[PDB]
Structure 1
């Protein structure tokens, strides 16, 4: 693949709690993506794994679903168990049963805690599928947003909010992140979360419109 770099441009803000707040300015301490961060850009034409640094911000903008099925295994071999979070257009399987995978794992189209299969009905179904993955206290939380764009050059100068989807208990020592390819071209951005303090502005309808990163520059420290 081809590795590039692109500025984040105030992207990747989600809902920190399942509580309706309207016309307030709430300050929260949660694993966020910092403003104007140095995220990477991948042009998949080939493909090793990635280090799962406490959260992955996924910002694929092209169509199709060749990049689906990201697995969250610690070691993708025997002895120590591997976690399988394969996603598809039919079903999602959340399995930890060791298995065996290569140094460049992929889905070839042509033990301890098995089954635990979910249906993923909202995922069953300008395609900017902005995704945020998290692992706090063994739980698995998915934040998603489908936001249209005018031009597909770079990330736009706007704002978006991300809503939580699921909650799956795993509780293992996840250290590295890996996407899977259903081999029988792809442009996607990867961002890494960080413990940061945000000041979230809810409107009168209860949605986040503006935010301020409290540890970016002294002006934002004064604002917070």
Structure 2
């Protein structure tokens, strides 16, 4: 695969909890993607495993839904339960099992110590889709957002808050992950979360419209 490097451009803020707040500035201390970070743009035409380092911000712009899912885990050659995300465009299968994949994961498109199983609404529905995966205290948390962009050249400028979908109490010592591609090509951005303090602004409608990262530059530390 081909790697390029891109600025994050103050992007990747999620709702910290399911509590409505309006017209107030709230300070939180969570695993956030830092502002103006160094995200990695991956073009896939050819796959070593990507490290899972305290949460992953995933961004995609695939219109035709080539991108499908992720293989969070440690071994990824059966032999465990690991974690799996498979979309059938009508359901999501987060069954912690295997499919006997090699080093190149793939998906052909034309139960051995099963601990957890979950079926929900479809996951993957100017088409920038952002996800955040984190693992705290044995809990796997996923945040997501859909945003339309004007021109597809890099990550756009602005604030788009991410909303939670799915909480899972399993996954167990996740340290590597691979992303599914199905061929009957890819332009996906990967960034790494860090423990950071943020100051979030809620407007009168309860929406996060602005944020300050309290460790970027001394002006933002003064603001915090």
Global fold match (TM > 0.5): yes
Distance change >3 Å, CA 130–CA 98, structure 1 → 2:
closer
Distance 1:119 1:172 in 2: 20
- Where 2:70 maps in the other structure, the secondary structure is coil
Equivalent residue for 2:49? Answer: 49
Distance 2:113 2:139 in 1: 16
In the TM superposition, residue 110 of structure 1 has moved relative to its aligned partner by 5.4
Distance 2:78 2:117 in 1: 22
Given that residues 39 and 191 in structure 2 are in contact (C-alpha distance below 8 angstroms), is that contact kept between their aligned partners in structure 1? Answer: yes
In the TM superposition, residue 106 of structure 1 has moved relative to its aligned partner by 1.7
Given that residues 92 and 121 in structure 2 are in contact (C-alpha distance below 8 angstroms), is that contact kept between their aligned partners in structure 1? Answer: no
Compare 77-86 and 39-48 and name the one that shifted more: 77-86
- Where 2:221 maps in the other structure, the secondary structure is helix
Distance change >3 Å, CA 185–CA 125, structure 1 → 2:
closer
Distance change >3 Å, CA 70–CA 97, structure 1 → 2:
closer
Distance 1:123 1:110 in 2: 21
Distance 2:125 2:218 in 1: 44
In the TM superposition, residue 185 of structure 1 has moved relative to its aligned partner by 2.0
Equivalent residue for 1:211? Answer: 211
Distance change >3 Å, CA 120–CA 209, structure 1 → 2:
same
Tell me the alpha carbon deviations over residues 37-77 of structure 1, each in whole angstroms, 9 at most, x when there is no partner. Answer: 00000111122221011111111123122121111121112
Distance 1:78 1:133 in 2: 22
Given that residues 90 and 124 in structure 1 are in contact (C-alpha distance below 8 angstroms), is that contact kept between their aligned partners in structure 2? Answer: no
Compare 90-99 and 200-209 and name the one that shifted more: 90-99
Tell me the alpha carbon deviations over residues 167-220 of structure 1, each in whole angstroms, 9 at most, x when there is no partner. Answer: 111151110011112234211111111100000010111110110000111111
Runs of 4 or more off by more than 4 Å in structure 1? 110-113
Q: TM-score, normalised by structure 2?
A: 0.92
In the TM superposition, residue 85 of structure 1 has moved relative to its aligned partner by 2.4
Tell me the alpha carbon deviations over residues 23-43 of structure 1, each in whole angstroms, 9 at most, x when there is no partner. Answer: 111100000000000000011
- Where 1:40 maps in the other structure, the secondary structure is strand
Given that residues 47 and 103 in structure 2 are in contact (C-alpha distance below 8 angstroms), is that contact kept between their aligned partners in structure 1? Answer: no
Q: How big is the alpha-carbon RMSD for the aligned residues of Structure 1 and Structure 2?
A: 1.9
Compare 79-88 and 68-77 and name the one that shifted more: 79-88
Gaps of 5+ in 1: none
Distance change >3 Å, CA 60–CA 78, structure 1 → 2:
closer
Distance 1:143 1:40 in 2: 20
Compare 120-129 and 16-25 and name the one that shifted more: 120-129
Compare 69-78 and 158-167 and name the one that shifted more: 69-78
Distance 2:80 2:54 in 1: 20
Tell me the alpha carbon deviations over residues 100-154 of structure 1, each in whole angstroms, 9 at most, x when there is no partner. Answer: 3211222223555427543432537411111111111222222111111111112
Distance change >3 Å, CA 207–CA 81, structure 1 → 2:
same
Given that residues 42 and 188 in structure 1 are in contact (C-alpha distance below 8 angstroms), is that contact kept between their aligned partners in structure 2? Answer: yes
